[PDB]
RNA sequence: AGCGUGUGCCUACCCUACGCCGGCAGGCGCGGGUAACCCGUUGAACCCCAUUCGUGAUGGGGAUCGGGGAUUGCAAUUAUUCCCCAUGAACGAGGAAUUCCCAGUAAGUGCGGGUCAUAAGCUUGCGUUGAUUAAGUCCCUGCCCUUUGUACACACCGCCCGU
RNA sequence: AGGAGUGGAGCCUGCGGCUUAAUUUGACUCAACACGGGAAACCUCACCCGGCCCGGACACGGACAGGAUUGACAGAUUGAU
């Protein structure tokens, strides 16, 4: 219940919309654009993308930081 | 304005001083921590926080990092500093002196009251 | 991380590191000749272990 | 006059660090800034001995008697 | 409950082989002692096994340390329709 | 001398001889034992023999306190424990009051088990030496039984009179 | 009739009281007070100050593979990477 002390809320997770229609490119022809460095590693599969910040990209369950 | 010494030499030694000669110019229960093995297994904030006192501010009063620890032998490397170590329930500030060195940081915070005494 | 976190304090050595086979608590415990095992549920299946009143 | 380091009863000072003797004026004084020395640092070991009580870290709820009227 | 899908296939084969297993209460244990070939903990086991209690496909019985599981034909015949099996392998305890 | 104890399902903490280093607590190699075999003939303490001490809060008593050194554990400060040197208080057999005890018994000692990672001022046993007094009483303190009286039966913490 | 004593001195332990943010509680004549096999550095822990996880099995109704959510990185952040 609500005390004294303040609860902080769970992390939120905002429902993103047309995500998965934001990997490729899609132009006239049916070759594939993607936006995202592949993982190279066997922790995660080929088609496991990076994520995309504004400086480094950073892997999912492998957890693995590739600086520049 | 009088010189401080431990044992015979100066502070910048001891800054210039390293690990394996500490052990032996510290006292026997000092350096069975130090020679112990490495602060990993549990001193993981023992390594950021000789990293947060190593991090250097410019010309003023010195940086304020309280601290959920009360085994910590205290080193020449971060005398002059400004910590405050918990108490239970808030923490004691104790300006770093040169003659501070030796000793425990929980030590030199009061934890209890001291006991008055009315009427029974 | 809370998988890690979990076990932080090791149970090598200390009280902790053994409880009661019967019961689960980890009071009034004998060690002598590997029981491992409290001393009240001790009394209640003492018979049934061939332990008997002799002395 | 080849006598054991380890028989004397101080060793490692924190003044100086060499093994020595001690006189029983020396011996006064030595503890005397040793209990200035702990007030002045602000220990718990100094507010023990300046308060009287135990310093070796004991029970005093029953024993102690003959601390105060 | 954010349990994996393998881990618990894997306790489901081993439940339809024989439908009898024993698992003592700890929390604080990341491996099960019979199931060494894989990493599989025991608590994520135990509330799949209540799970199924309240379910109603198996019964519970605790003795001293371990909780005891037993399979019936109405559980059969759900892990039948679970692991979509035909009805022709049997698990061993009807069997002679 | 005698009870003992001694390498583990979860578990990893067992008991040790021998050989060097160090005053010391302790450090490193080297074997035995899943146990009448190895610790272990468990060379225990007390006691005995020969000096020193000399009635003085003293070589009795070791509380308190400072420094140094080792082991356990992730961590010892509010000293975990031990070792070494200094520090040497009260205490001259304790008022009223009160407890335990009849033969290997009380008592003086030491050794095992539980507690235990480090571990005994506690407890349970083992062993050494080993007495004074008594073969009774209801005085004290309680218990039990008989007789007697009862206007009591939820039973004296009872019933019950009058303003 | 005795013997050993306790109560006297110092020290260990428990209880009461006082104190404490907390000094957790039971046990008050035999028949409680070195008792809970309770010699508590951390777990013990039941006490205080602080922060996460669910370990809400599930029955129904809102949501469903187009995403219902856990696992993390330069850095303010307690206390911790
Ligand atoms: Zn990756």
């Known amino acids: 219940k609500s005390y004294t002390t303040p609860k902080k809320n769970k992390h939120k997770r905002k429902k993103v919309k047309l995500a998965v229609l934001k990997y490729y490119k899609v132009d006239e022809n049916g070759k594939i654009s993607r936006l995202r460095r592949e993982?190279?590693?066997?922790?995660?599969?080929?088609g496991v993308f990076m994520a995309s910040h504004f400086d480094r990209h950073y892997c999912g369950k492998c957890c693995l930081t590739y600086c520049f | 304005f009088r010189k401080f010494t431990y044992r015979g030499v100066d502070l910048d030694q001891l800054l210039d001083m390293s690990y394996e000669q500490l052990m032996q110019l510290y006292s026997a229960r000092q350096r069975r921590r130090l020679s112990r093995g490495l602060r990993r297994k549990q001193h993981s904030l023992l390594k950021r926080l000789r990293k947060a006192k190593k991090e250097a501010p410019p010309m003023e009063k010195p940086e304020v990092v309280k601290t959920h620890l009360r085994d910590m032998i205290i080193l020449p490397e971060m005398?002059?500093?400004?910590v405050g170590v918990y108490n239970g329930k808030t923490f004691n500030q104790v300006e770093i002196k040169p003659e501070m060195i030796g000793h425990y940081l929980g030590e030199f915070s009061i934890t209890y009251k001291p006991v008055k005494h009315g009427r029974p | 991380g809370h998988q890690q976190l979990y076990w932080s304090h090791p149970r090598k050595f200390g009280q902790g590191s053994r409880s009661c086979r019967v019961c689960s608590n980890r009071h009034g415990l004998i060690r002598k000749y590997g029981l491992n095992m409290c001393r009240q549920c001790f009394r209640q299946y003492a018979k049934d272990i061939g332990f008997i009143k002799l002395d | 006059y080849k006598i054991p380091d380890w028989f004397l009863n101080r060793q490692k000072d924190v003044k100086d660090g060499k093994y020595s003797q001690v006189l029983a004026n020396g011996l006064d004084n030595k503890l005397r800034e040793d209990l200035e020395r702990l007030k002045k640092i602000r220990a718990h070991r100094g507010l023990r001995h300046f308060w009287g009580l135990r310093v070796r870290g004991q029970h005093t709820k029953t024993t102690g008697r003959r601390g105060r009227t | 409950m954010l349990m994996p899908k393998k881990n618990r296939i894997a306790?489901?084969?081993?439940?339809?082989?024989?439908?009898?297993?024993?698992?003592?209460?700890?929390?604080?244990?990341?491996?099960?002692?019979?199931?060494?070939?894989?990493?599989?903990?025991?608590?994520?086991?135990?509330?799949?096994?209540?799970?199924?209690?309240?379910?109603?496909?198996?019964?519970?019985?605790?003795?001293?340390?371990?909780?005891?599981?037993?399979?019936?034909?109405?559980?059969?015949?759900?892990?039948?329709?679970?692991?979509?099996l035909p009805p022709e392998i049997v698990p061993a305890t009807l069997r002679r």
């Open chain 1, 39 to 46: 993982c190279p590693s066997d922790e995660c599969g080929a």
């Open chain 2, 79 to 82: 005398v002059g500093s400004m």
């Open chain 5, 11 to 84: 306790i489901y084969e081993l439940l339809f082989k024989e439908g009898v297993m024993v698992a003592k209460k700890d929390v604080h244990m990341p491996k099960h002692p019979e199931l060494a070939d894989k990493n599989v903990p025991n608590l994520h086991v135990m509330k799949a096994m209540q799970s199924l209690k309240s379910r109603g496909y198996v019964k519970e019985q605790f003795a001293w340390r371990h909780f005891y599981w037993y399979l019936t034909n109405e559980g059969i015949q759900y892990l039948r329709d679970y692991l979509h």
